[model samples]
Target: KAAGDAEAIAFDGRTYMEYHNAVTKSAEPSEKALQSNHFELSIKTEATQGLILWSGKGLERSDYIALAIVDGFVQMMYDLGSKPVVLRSTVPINTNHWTHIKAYRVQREGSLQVGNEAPITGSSPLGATQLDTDGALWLGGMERLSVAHKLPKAYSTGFIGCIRDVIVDRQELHLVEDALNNPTILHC
Candidate 1:
């Protein structure tokens, strides 16, 4: 057999095993998804991280994207006071042209700047307080590598959109750079 493209996932051109996340394309609401993609990251037999953020063209205005932290913990988010929570560009939404999104744990400063532009108008947090939880993370199905717990509702719970870049700091070094300037192609 032979291998081809489309068999990999990367952020900013760098590659890192997805900590934990799931994808679903749906037209009609039901048990089955129109299309689906799933990823799980295992640091060891012990530790794992849930999807702190996600973005793509498949996510549109009316469409609903979700992230389930551990278990019995799933919610849909986007708009948060002044910051859209999901920091996308001003361009029209499309499945091809990539946009950009950035997430920070803020508590005091409310307004956030996007791509050198004036900060997006919104309520900032005094700080990025950690969410409380102690169970392992699960992408789509339940029952995963057990490291899960529970936290408060006032916490941040939303995703950015139309982003070419996920805009993470330390991990970004390991993610695939945006498509155009990606120099290396790391495989898992």
Candidate 2:
């Protein structure tokens, strides 16, 4: 009932959403929304190789907030302002199957749960304040940075599989519809 009957968009490892500031610049969520002290990001997806599910700009050269699958591991990065804390699962992710992954941040603690398995928890490097940024929330993959950033060339590219739903909190965002409506919300 959470996802409803909404359909998800499929990514060919090259396609992605840029969701610019326009979509996110509206009224910021309420303090209750921001200070829930308990939040979760869940997505239904499938992949054969490692890939990035989401990412955003950071304040540093390589600063970025991202969720990705690297070498069969589920990874989450939070680098809104300071050094990014990357939380990853030691257990290899089960690929090719329709998988439901929930990355939860309760208070300052973070954890990841795939399917019906046990949750893997860790400490968060971020503070209690909600993250604020003008950067776009990129899906499927990250965009290449400029020269001044001194970043390496693109390695991950985009997600090489299908994606169905992306739920933040309990809201299922119509990512494809939103991007279609904005048009300009598809670039970094």
Candidate 3:
């Protein structure tokens, strides 16, 4: 049980959860958890906060980003140990706009990605030593799978925002992006 308050939406064709209580119960049950590993729960907070890609970083404070809350920056990607570079949130996310949110997990190596197709070829340190990915991954729920609003600590309980098309497997990212502009959602 961590801390913070978050909500999930069901506007998409798939079933959404206001909070995943069952998943929350399985967080790492050890004080040593904060020393290694961390988790990331991606969400498309399209209603209020816009698209958010949050991780269990044990951040000292929860950033309540408003509409277009991004810090006027693009490409919020990070890595574990400066090797496997994992992409975070891309720039220009708008409210209510549907987009795919991905959180890649690599044990010993933080999330991995080829930033700008530049090919970093190694793990980029995930930063923050508080969160440990050993915990179960969440879609929409409290921090570290907890339902309590602990506030400003490792694994706070707060649903980042509304989300859709959440995928744990990173390989599907390209397909997800292609679908956004597929003929089905576009005019022939």
Best by TM-score: 2
Better of 1 and 3 by lDDT: 3
Q: Which ten residues in a row have the lowest lDDT in candidate 3?
A: 179-188
Local distance difference test values of all predictions, in order: 0.25, 0.51, 0.29
Error of 3 at 135 (Å): 1.8
- Model 2, global lDDT: 0.51
- Give lDDT tens digits, candidate 2, residues 1-188: 22446464556666766654342212464212232122233343455344454443433443344567765666765543444556766655545555667775544466777677687777655553344444345666655534113321222645665556666545555676655223222211
The 10-residue segment of model 1 with minimum total lDDT is 40-49
TM-score, candidate number 3: 0.35
To one decimal, what is the Cα RMSD in angstroms of model 2 from the true structure?
A: 6.2
Sort by TM-score, top down from the best: 2, 3, 1
lDDT of 1 by residue, 146-185 (tens): 2112222212222111112222222322234323232334
Candidate 2 has what TM-score? Answer: 0.66
Off by over 4 Å in 2: 1-6, 20-49, 58-63, 126-129, 145-155, 180-188
Model 3, residue 182: displacement in angstroms? Answer: 36
